[PDB]
């Protein structure tokens, strides 16, 4: 239970990291989809995101 404790913070930490990663990517796609009636950084930042 000290290894369930350390294991719990371990996999909690790693899943927190990957959750932060996908949060960043979907956050960037939200930054893409937010831009309406601009059409200029659309292909720039959006095509940067899809890269």
């Amino acid at each position: 239970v000290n290894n369930k404790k350390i294991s719990l913070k371990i996999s909690e930490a790693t899943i927190l990291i990957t959750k932060v990663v996908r949060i960043l990517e979907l956050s960037s796609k939200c930054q893409e989809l937010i831009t309406e009636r601009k059409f200029f950084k659309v292909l720039q930042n959006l095509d940067s995101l899809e890269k």
Binding site: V1, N2, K5, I6
Partner: protein, 49 residues
């Protein structure tokens, strides 16, 4: 923290301590074991005899 190190303290300290005490008492048990075995086969000389 010292819940986990309390498992190190009680579990490691008591495990090592009563490991030596219980295993040494088990060595006294093995002394009684070879005692009764020696008296056993020594009484079992009349079997072959």
């Amino acid at each position: 923290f010292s819940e986990q190190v309390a498992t190190q303290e009680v579990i490691h300290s008591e495990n090592v301590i009563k490991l030596s005490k219980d295993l040494h008492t088990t060595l006294l048990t093995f002394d009684k074991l070879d005692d009764r075995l020696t008296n056993v086969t020594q009484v079992v000389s009349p079997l072959g005899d």
